[PDB]
Design a binder for this molecule. Structure first.
Ligand SMILES: [Cl-]
Ligand SMILES: [Cl-]
Ligand code: NA
Ligand SMILES: [Zn+2]
Ligand SMILES: [Zn+2]
Lengths: 21, 30, 30, 21
């Protein structure tokens, strides 16, 4: 899911910006 | 920016703290 | 007044716990 | 508002599900 993204793996300044509304 | 494994009351506040004035969404469901 | 930038950090933190796994959506407008 | 509901007023855990997905 998303955890696999930032908690499972390290996240960068913009990969979360994909997660904003 | 910090590069870590985002989890805990550490990441949520980052997603909020980063996304700022716009908004965000959380899916605990994988 | 009352500052929401701060109010949110506690709210979002706590929300994570409360909402649990079903997840949640944070709209910084209402 | 939500920030309007817990800022000037404190809220309890149950009363937070109102904002949960
Ligand atoms: Cl920790
Ligand atoms: Cl505070
Ligand atoms: Na903390
Ligand atoms: Zn921690
Ligand atoms: Zn505070």
């Amino acid at each position: 899911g998303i955890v696999e993204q930032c908690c499972t793996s390290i996240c960068s300044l913009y990969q979360l910006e994909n997660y904003c509304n | 920016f910090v590069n870590q494994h985002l989890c805990g009351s550490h990441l949520v506040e980052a997603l909020y703290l980063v996304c700022g004035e716009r908004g965000f969404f959380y899916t605990p469901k994988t």
